[PDB]
Amino acid sequence: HWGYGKHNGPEHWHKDFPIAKGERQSPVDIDTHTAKYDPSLKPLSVSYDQATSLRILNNGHAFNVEFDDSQDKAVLKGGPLDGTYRLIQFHFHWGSLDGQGSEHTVDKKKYAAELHLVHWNTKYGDFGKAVQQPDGLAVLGIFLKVGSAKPGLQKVVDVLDSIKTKGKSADFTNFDPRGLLPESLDYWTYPGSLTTPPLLECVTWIVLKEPISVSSQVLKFRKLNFNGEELMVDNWRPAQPLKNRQIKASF
Amino acid sequence: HHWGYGKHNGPEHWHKDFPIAKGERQSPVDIDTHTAKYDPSLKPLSVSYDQATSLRILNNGHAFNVEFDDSQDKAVLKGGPLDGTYRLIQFHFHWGSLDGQGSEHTVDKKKYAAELHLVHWNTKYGDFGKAVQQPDGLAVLGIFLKVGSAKPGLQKVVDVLDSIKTKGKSADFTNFDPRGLLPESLDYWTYPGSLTTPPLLECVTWIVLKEPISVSSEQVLKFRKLNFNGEGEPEELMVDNWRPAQPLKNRQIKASFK
Ligand SMILES: [Zn+2]
Ligand SMILES: [Zn+2]
Ligand SMILES: [Zn+2]
Ligand SMILES: [Zn+2]
Ligand SMILES: [Zn+2]
Ligand SMILES: [Zn+2]
Ligand SMILES: [Zn+2]
Ligand SMILES: [Zn+2]
Ligand SMILES: [Zn+2]
Ligand SMILES: [Zn+2]
Ligand SMILES: [Zn+2]
Ligand SMILES: [Zn+2]
Ligand SMILES: [Zn+2]
Ligand SMILES: [Zn+2]
Ligand SMILES: [Zn+2]
């Protein structure tokens, strides 16, 4: 089935997923000359104070860190969001070199990786029902630059050798995703979709402008395997056309 | 979330999202021994598990599965009602909350405490994926589990069940010999059946062994301690993970023995 190589990479997803050539595909290039400041955009409310991580798993496409989403404890409110969106998981996309790896780009600049924290609209009762609505998910995107070691990322780096290959998972409790944020919550936003199959058009994207720094920490990401050898690198979709959409800036 | 065996998503309710559940060749069925007639043209069953190469054991929230390397003809099923070679891809069990229930197939309406299913695909079609989409695609060998003395061959599988307690977990599971899970007698019944779980595709030549294997109360009590749910979700014990018998329709169950 699908993946990122020559055979099943983003080039070839349109074959089994016709929606890949759709109105609201993600990611996109965020052009800062055209992304205009909208003052009616409210400030972003992130409450991860009581987040409850459960496990970390390698699914042959990325690794995911899942959370208890049975209550409003780790939620996203404000910004462009009407209602409350609970945190279900986070994962990264990254590249084989430091000059590539982010899904979103800023003025065509690529970063070394991109952190995606996925949230679903509590309006629809569960994740499954949410994904089949345009306002179903909200993904907070955060760019990863090369620099000093992200102290908050170190716990996650730690545990990557015990989920080296596809199918493996480890218990992963008491993780604080506040530690993965930049200081500034300034963002861009636009009506996007999932960057992997099934590519459903159900995401309000929220991309943070301030990247977080990580150490040349990124070399542990690249040691993970796509297989259960093919190294898990360049697991990003390239930018898609922006079409009739408008990227709006909070700042 | 999706289908299972409870009150809201159990076999009663599978017809809702899987219309084939009310089809021509559903499994399991009650095997009635007064109507299942001995066919002498049925050949003897050839089981070659001498070189089987188990890889891993995983809890998928429905059963646990033990997977094998199926890239060569090393663990195969030939003879019996089968034209061609069927390689072993995995095995799993179905079981119940009590000793008086748990098997999918029944014999003269008798239920057993569990049923072992060794799944094989017809090498004719090149891979598992292509095989399931043909009536002669899979061959599942069914084996009934009675309560009695401890199955020495089952003990290595019992041993590793606490490290895959919940949905999504798996452990490395190498050098397992599935010969140790067989009864002495290979006498069987056979009929054109299908998968007993969704997607319930009608692609199985069923082969059910008549001689059950014995297991200990201690051994089956480890099955029942597994969870349908993942770590963190609320508790639901993995028991009664069997589909009840389905109508036989226009089919004929044939016996290898007098
Ligand atoms: Zn094409
Ligand atoms: Zn996949
Ligand atoms: Zn949940
Ligand atoms: Zn609520
Ligand atoms: Zn992503
Ligand atoms: Zn655990
Ligand atoms: Zn109905
Ligand atoms: Zn009868
Ligand atoms: Zn009779
Ligand atoms: Zn009769
Ligand atoms: Zn399932
Ligand atoms: Zn294989
Ligand atoms: Zn089965
Ligand atoms: Zn291992
Ligand atoms: Zn439940």
Swiss-Prot record, chain A:
Changing residue 195 to S/V: Reduced activity. The modification Phosphoserine is found at residues 162, 169. The record marks 4, 59, 64 as: Fine-tunes the proton-transfer properties of H-64. The active site is at residue 61. Keywords: Acetylation, Cell membrane, Cytoplasm, Disease variant, Lyase, Membrane, Metal-binding, Osteopetrosis, Phosphoprotein, Zinc. Its cofactor is Zn(2+); Co(2+). It is found in: Cytoplasm; Cell membrane. Its EC number is 4.2.1.1, 4.2.1.69. Zn(2+) binds at residues 91, 93, 116. Substrate binds at residues 195-196. Zinc. Can also use cobalt(II) with lower efficiency, but not copper(II), nickel(II) and manganese(II). Catalyzes the reversible hydration of carbon dioxide. Can also hydrate cyanamide to urea. Stimulates the chloride-bicarbonate exchange activity of SLC26A6. Essential for bone resorption and osteoclast differentiation. Involved in the regulation of fluid secretion into the anterior chamber of the eye. Contributes to intracellular pH regulation in the duodenal upper villous epithelium during proton-coupled peptide absorption. This is Carbonic anhydrase 2. It comes from Homo sapiens (Human).
Curated annotation (Swiss-Prot), chain B:
GO terms for cellular component: apical part of cell; cytoplasm; cytosol; extracellular exosome; myelin sheath; plasma membrane. GO terms for molecular function: arylesterase activity; carbonate dehydratase activity; cyanamide hydratase activity; zinc ion binding. The record marks 5, 60, 65 as: Fine-tunes the proton-transfer properties of H-64. It holds the Pfam family Carb_anhydrase. The active site is at residue 62. The keyword Cytoplasm applies. Changing residue 5 to F: Enhanced activity. Changing residue 63 to S: 2-fold decrease in enzyme efficiency, as determined by kcat/KM ratio, and efficiently inhibited by chlorzolamide. Changing residue 90 to P: In OPTB3; in Czechoslovakia. The record marks 90 as: Involved in the binding of some activators, including histamine and L-histidine. Changing residue 62 to G: Impaired activity, not rescued by 4-methylimidazole (4-MI). Changing residue 119 to K/R: Strongly reduced CO(2) hydrase and p-nitrophenyl acetate esterase activities. Its cofactor is Zn(2+); Co(2+). Changing residue 62 to W: Impaired activity, rescued by 4-methylimidazole (4-MI). Impaired activity, not rescued by 4-methylimidazole (4-MI). Changing residue 117 to D/N/Q: Reduced activity. Activated by X-ray, histamine, L-adrenaline, L- and D-phenylalanine, L- and D-histidine, L-His-OMe and beta-Ala-His (carnosine). Changing residue 104 to A/Q: Strongly reduced CO(2) hydrase activity. Zn(2+) binds at residues 92, 94, 117. Interacts with SLC4A4. Interaction with SLC4A7 regulates SLC4A7 transporter activity. Interacts with SLC26A6 isoform 4 (via C-terminus cytoplasmic domain). It is linked to Osteopetrosis, autosomal recessive 3: A rare genetic disease characterized by abnormally dense bone, due to defective resorption of immature bone. Osteopetrosis occurs in two forms: a severe autosomal recessive form occurring in utero, infancy, or childhood, and a benign autosomal dominant form occurring in adolescence or adulthood. Recessive osteopetrosis commonly manifests in early infancy with macrocephaly, feeding difficulties, evolving blindness and deafness, bone marrow failure, severe anemia, and hepatosplenomegaly. This is Carbonic anhydrase 2. It comes from Homo sapiens (Human). The gene is CA2.
